[PDB]
Design an enzyme around this catalytic site. Sequence first.
Site, PDB file in Angstrom:
ATOM      1  N   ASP A  94       4.703  22.117  -8.976  1.00  0.00           N
ATOM      2  CA  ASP A  94       4.563  21.453  -7.878  1.00  0.00           C
ATOM      3  C   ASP A  94       3.198  21.874  -7.014  1.00  0.00           C
ATOM      4  OD1 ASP A  94       5.367  20.547  -4.854  1.00  0.00           O
ATOM      5  OD2 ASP A  94       7.355  20.368  -5.965  1.00  0.00           O
ATOM      6  N   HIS A 134       3.052  15.893  -5.242  1.00  0.00           N
ATOM      7  CA  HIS A 134       3.669  17.469  -5.503  1.00  0.00           C
ATOM      8  C   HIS A 134       2.721  17.914  -6.743  1.00  0.00           C
ATOM      9  CE1 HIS A 134       7.998  17.075  -3.874  1.00  0.00           C
ATOM     10  NE2 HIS A 134       7.180  16.170  -3.148  1.00  0.00           N
ATOM     11  N   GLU A 146       8.164  10.968  -3.213  1.00  0.00           N
ATOM     12  CA  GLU A 146       7.576  10.057  -2.282  1.00  0.00           C
ATOM     13  C   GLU A 146       5.808  10.252  -2.088  1.00  0.00           C
ATOM     14  OE1 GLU A 146       6.908   6.608  -0.073  1.00  0.00           O
ATOM     15  OE2 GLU A 146       8.826   7.330  -1.208  1.00  0.00           O
TER      16      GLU A 146
END
Length: 572
Positions: free
Chosen positions: A227, A281, A346
């Site tokens: 991430d 991310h 997203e």
Amino acid sequence: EDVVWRWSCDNGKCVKLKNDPRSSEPALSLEACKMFCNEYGLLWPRPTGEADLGNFLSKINLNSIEVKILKKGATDDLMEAAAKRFKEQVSLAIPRGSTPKLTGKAVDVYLVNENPNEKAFSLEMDESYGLRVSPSGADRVNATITANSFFGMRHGLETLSQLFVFDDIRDHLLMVRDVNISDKPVYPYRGILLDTARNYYSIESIKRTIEAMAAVKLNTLHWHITDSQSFPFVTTKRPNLYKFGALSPQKVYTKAAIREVVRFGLERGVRVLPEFDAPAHVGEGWQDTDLTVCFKAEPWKSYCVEPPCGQLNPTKDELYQYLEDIYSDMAEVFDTTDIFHMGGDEVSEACWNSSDSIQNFMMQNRWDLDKESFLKLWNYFQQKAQDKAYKAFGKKLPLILWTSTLTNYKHIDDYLNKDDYIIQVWTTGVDPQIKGLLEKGYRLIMSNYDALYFDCGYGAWVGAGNNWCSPYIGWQKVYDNSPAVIALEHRDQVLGGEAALWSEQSDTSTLDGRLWPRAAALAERLWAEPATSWQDAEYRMLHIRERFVRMGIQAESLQPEWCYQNEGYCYS
Ligand SMILES: Cc1nnc(CNCCN2C(=O)c3cccc4cccc(c34)C2=O)s1
Ligand SMILES: *[C@@H]1O[C@H](CO)[C@@H](O)[C@H](O)[C@H]1NC(C)=O
Ligand SMILES: *[C@@H]1O[C@H](CO)[C@@H](O)[C@H](O)[C@H]1NC(C)=O
């Protein structure tokens, strides 16, 4: 000293009574009473087919348990390991600090795997089995597990080990005398998402998780390994990513460690499904590559949902050479997975729009600088990423993406298709998106944030108050959450569900409590899909918690132990 109480069944409840010496009735221990007072005894999860447990128990010699594998094949290593693992599982019936008397019958476990060559994970794999237990002559027991594959077979070993109870009144190890069980899961995908990038999780804690997953027959670990906060995945072809991305040199996941985990999972019927979340991310690890934008952009609320901000720049050809290498390194060590997760979290238009190179790319190609234009950029990215993933795994394989703007059912068919993409759903089960998706033929993995986000309910990690998806989801709410109710007719399109442990506020130390025993509720829901609700599973859930603790899992406490010894008295 020695146990002073006894238990007696009365309207489906084990009531605690004094063990008066002036009685001709043989006293029952708490779990001996439970095994027969309860509809499904001490089983978790409860079987889907036949659940005949009979009426009696039998004293068993712990040292006289022998496992025999009848059909031999490619899965010999796996079956032999699972059999050696069986003796240890039986000992979990025994409380630590209590030793069983070495007497009673001998147990012969007969494993028949009728396709001993199958060892690949697939959504179509057969996890069904049959369990027969009966006395064998005078001094032994015939335990026979029959299944179409190793996976169903080790599922059967698991269920068999749950048919042992310890009598702490007499110090006797007991087993159910006459059982006939036929069983198979309703959903093929039963999983846990473990985020190991917002915080690090020791390899040992991960193996411990897989160990607990197997105990309640969950078959998928979705390893959210990267991430924006860190890059612990050791990528040999792009070592600069983990060198700069990892929280520390020791906080890393090497090829040897990942292989250990993957193999450990395979031995236990657990698919280790790796995820590389993109094009959002990302962050740590990509410094000085010039392949990201918005990293540590301030103020962060303008650019991403949580700090640090950072997204990949799709307009750069070199990105896809990095991506191909990352995927290839994953494909090499995650070599039991039949599926690959590509995130699809997203994307922030604000971030992409703040880049010079990106805007020029969209102008010089005629696109505009509006929401629909950036949706094209995302489609442009995902198409190229997908191509590299296929090349990396050396084959076409199903890909998973989250419900997002990109996967809105209104336009998902523009570049995605339902044969190549599985959709993971975080939205609530009453959202139009689920119905809209189901109607266009898409398969779903349920992870709805109001029942399946295991991170909810704690303090804020930015500012004060609580975290965004509070309150904390009790096991009751996760048990009652049914995909069959959500899916309705299109329920075959539902592959199953996944408990999601995001790790902004969870790591090695909090891992056990976060997952257990709440994930066991998901385990039963996905294995059996009961028409009955959580109240009918309560007593068995209390027992499975104790079993976890006995395994060394630091599971959450649900109720006072008193409620467990006094069924019926704690209610509302
Ligand atoms: C995959 C997906 N997992 N979760 C998804 C939904 N994002 C929830 C939105 N959200 C929030 O709505 C939010 C509100 C107030 C404080 C917050 C602090 C950190 C993070 C959030 C957050 C936050 O992520 S999509
Ligand atoms: C054990 O039980 C199974 C199922 O009832 C039976 O078919 C099998 O022959 C038994 N095995 C032995 C050796 O007793
Ligand atoms: C991107 O920025 C330009 C100005 O730099 C603006 O006209 C456009 O509306 C922005 N796009 C979005 C989606 O905000």
